[PDB]
Design a binder for these strands. Structure first.
Lengths: 330, 108, 124, 333
RNA sequence: CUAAGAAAUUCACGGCGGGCUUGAUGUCCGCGUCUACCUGGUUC
């Protein structure tokens, strides 16, 4: 007799913050601490009817009477200044450690076997495989989602803060490091070992991450956008913290855990964010189907209940979405 | 036809019942309803107070009421492409056509 | 396949006509009875005929399972459900066709979900 | 093989908002510190000239309209009284990766679409679309109503590699037409540059300046903002103008519409001229739609013919599909 | 030339003692707002 508890919850490790945007000139990015913020303004927009209309009602009368109707929309837009060409994005990140221990549980035997399974994992192999992939997703600039496409140069600065002062600095070139491979450098492995020590409880780390992207004078940046509930009525609004455009923290947290490449469909497509029934929202489909046996909710209770440990590349997936958090069980 | 008369009685008894009408919140925008369904002059009647809403053309209120009535009676290509939406617009036009004559005999 | 899965797979899909290739039409005709025939048909009537034949003690379970497997590969459009329950977090969401998404409706679990399904209807 | 339920294509050739300034000719080569034009306020007393119901009986609706004073307050942008030209400046960048969708459901549909665009680029280059995009840059068509009546306009284009200038082009936009797409001896270099940007072999950032000699204190026309009713009789109740934080300016979508006036393959007439690339390719200033689905030259119908059932259309209008896949938008059911 | 004509509801009062609401999250793609105007209202 052994079964899954009714309520089982996990808090998250790797808590990021929001990312405020700011604007300045390239080759002044060393003194980039008094640069002004990128603000959100509004503008008006009208356009024709261009959606794929239904063929049950497709006559020239409707197509010429739909043009004269006046469509006025108010949109939120965020640009760079006319004399600046570099976007700076800054946030902080702290990893916590204590990943296999739940925040709530019901059975007394289930948590004592889950802790033993996770401790057996950590004793067999450390957090050295997940941490280099997290440091890879920090090393390039995947947290810049659409601000990264088409940029001339990207540069990332990472500080380690252990008092009210810095302790270690890193500088990377985010376009030399791809978005496809996971290869090991000598400077990247120090950061990998640092955030591997942070995930094991053997220290307190707090990183400050800055990214510079060179796009061009007066060009359009893309902050995160909000939800509006409802003749010139606003149809798009953008997220903002005090007089500054921003990106949500959950979007950067999604861009950080694009880790797994062990899903059975392909590997030339590249990495996928770690989710149960691993699913891409822009693609519309769901890899790791429960008809196959490469789920979180199948590998987890085959590993814990029936003592059938999966392959080594598939244990990183279970530990990755235990690090992610959430409510499992019933 | 019943829905027009309920709004007429609500304008006649709601603003006309209470003996007070101060400055609206956002007077650059809250002045159409404060001018149409608003009372006569009061203690705060300035120089351009009793010579603005009674001397101006009180005929925009009919189109403003028709713009509110257009939301209630739903229109689309299912009705506008057929011949019943034209009569459904003409009935509202014949109803709101008296909205400037019966709703414009007070000031002018 | 169980019969509960048969009425489930019959009700959750749209009604489509001419959704089959002719190879699957003769494949289904090889697996149905002698007398009745389906041609230029929609989904529902096929579901009703195979349900009536399985209610009769005349058609076997592997054969109706092949029929419902073929209907499972063929139909690709589903009906959008009106309510959706998030189960660990105890929340009920309602579909809004103007946002093309589910918005937050109330707090509750399976009993409250069955209550609003019986009150408002399951599908859109 | 059906079509995908969602399909989204990102925009290539994205410009910024063009800012306006004023100076003098024979000083336009030193035009970096010119003062920027401001949006000013003035008053307008309106005389009624609108077409009323014909055969009006009384003068109680016409001779009484004169005694009712109309009060309008308008925004206007004027040149100074010592400046006789207008400088309009913006930047542009072309991306590449034109046939790859941003979001789609079907996995076997983009396997057809990507190889369709692949064999299009393999058969014909991007040069035919690029030389007409460079033509629309070369004339000053992004100046909409500031181009009319001007005695001399000219266009400077700088290719920006780093914080410097890699290549300069100087044109005369009245010597080349707004109606004909004919070859030149220097414009083909700009065409090859933006075609290399469109094909993915490098990144391209251009800066476009346009000088227009209008007059000593005339009126320029920036974009017009959609005004709300939260103003009094004074307080921009009639016409407001778009200004980005310092000075009057044009929207970015207006310049984007002025840069894709490229296509001349619509079967209405061979002398009417180019229009902008749209599905059901329409004009708003004219009110007329073209390319209806009654005819078969509509984008959705021939896209489903080309991709699904291998009906490759005519080559002279195969550039229309790629021209409105470069434009970007929301397609699919 | 009225379902007409007529009429006192009153006196007093202690609501009250305790408490952990929690755990995760990608809002995305695209757009042409144009043409006109004497405030010599009495901005008392």
């Amino acid at each position: 007799i052994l079964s899954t508890a009714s309520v089982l919850a996990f808090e998250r490790k790797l808590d990021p913050s929001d990312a405020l945007m700011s604007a300045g000139a390239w080759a002044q990015r060393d003194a980039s601490q008094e640069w002004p913020a990128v603000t959100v303004r509004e503008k008006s927009v009208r356009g024709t009817i261009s959606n794929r209309l239904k063929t049950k009602d497709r006559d020239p009368a409707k197509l010429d009477a739909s043009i004269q109707s006046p469509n006025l929309q108010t949109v939120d837009v965020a640009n760079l200044p006319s004399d600046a060409d570099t976007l700076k994005v800054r946030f902080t990140l702290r990893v916590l450690g204590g990943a296999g221990t739940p925040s709530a549980c019901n059975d007394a035997a289930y948590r004592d076997k889950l802790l033993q399974t996770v401790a057996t994992y950590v004793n067999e192999q450390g957090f050295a495989e997940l941490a280099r992939r997290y440091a890879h997703n920090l090393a390039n600039a995947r947290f810049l989602w659409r601000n990264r496409v088409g940029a001339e140069a990207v540069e990332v600065r990472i500080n380690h803060i252990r008092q009210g002062e810095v302790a270690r600095t890193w500088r990377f070139d985010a376009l030399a490091i791809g978005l496809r491979d996971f290869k090991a450098d000598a400077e990247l492995d120090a950061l990998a070992e640092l955030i591997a020590s942070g995930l094991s409880g053997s220290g307190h780390v707090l990183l400050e991450v800055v990214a510079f992207a060179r796009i061009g004078d007066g060009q359009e940046v893309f902050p995160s956008q909000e939800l509006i509930l409802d003749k010139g009525q606003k149809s798009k609004t953008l997220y903002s913290v005090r007089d500054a455009a921003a990106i949500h923290s959950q979007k950067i947290g999604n861009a950080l855990r694009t880790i797994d490449t062990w899903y059975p469909d392909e590997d030339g497509l590249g990495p996928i964010a770690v989710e149960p029934y691993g699913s891409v929202t822009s693609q519309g489909k769901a890899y790791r189907q429960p008809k196959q046996k490469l789920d979180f909710y199948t590998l987890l209770d085959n590993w814990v209940l029936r003592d059938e440990a999966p392959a080594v590349e598939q244990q990183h997936y279970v530990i990755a979405n235990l690090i992610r958090g959430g409510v499992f069980g019933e | 036809g019943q829905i027009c008369d309920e709004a007429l009685q609500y304008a006649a008894r709601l603003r006309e019942l209470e003996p007070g009408w101060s400055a609206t919140p956002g007077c650059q925008l809250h002045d159409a309803e404060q001018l149409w369904l608003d009372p006569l002059r009061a203690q705060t009647d300035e120089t351009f107070l009793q010579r603005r809403l009674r001397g101006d053309w009180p005929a925009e209120v009919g189109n403003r009421f028709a713009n509110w009535l257009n939301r209630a009676v739903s229109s689309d290509s299912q009705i506008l492409g057929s011949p019943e939406a034209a009569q459904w617009s003409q009935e509202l036009s014949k109803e709101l056509t008296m909205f400037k004559e019966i709703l414009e005999d007070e000031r002018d | 396949m169980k019969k509960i899965e048969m009425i489930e797979i019959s009700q959750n899909r749209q009604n489509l006509t001419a959704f089959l290739h002719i190879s699957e039409i003769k494949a289904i005709n090889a697996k149905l009875a002698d007398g009745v025939d389906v041609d230029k048909k929609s989904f529902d009537e096929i579901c009703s005929i195979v349900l009536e034949q399985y209610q009769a003690k005349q058609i076997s379970n592997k054969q109706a399972s092949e029929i419902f497997e073929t209907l499972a590969k063929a139909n690709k459009s589903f009906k959008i459900e009106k309510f959706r329950c998030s189960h660990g977090y105890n929340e009920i969401y309602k579909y809004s066709p103007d946002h093309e998404a589910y918005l937050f409706y109330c707090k509750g679990g399976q009993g409250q979900l069955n209550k609003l399904i019986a009150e408002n209807g399951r599908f859109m």
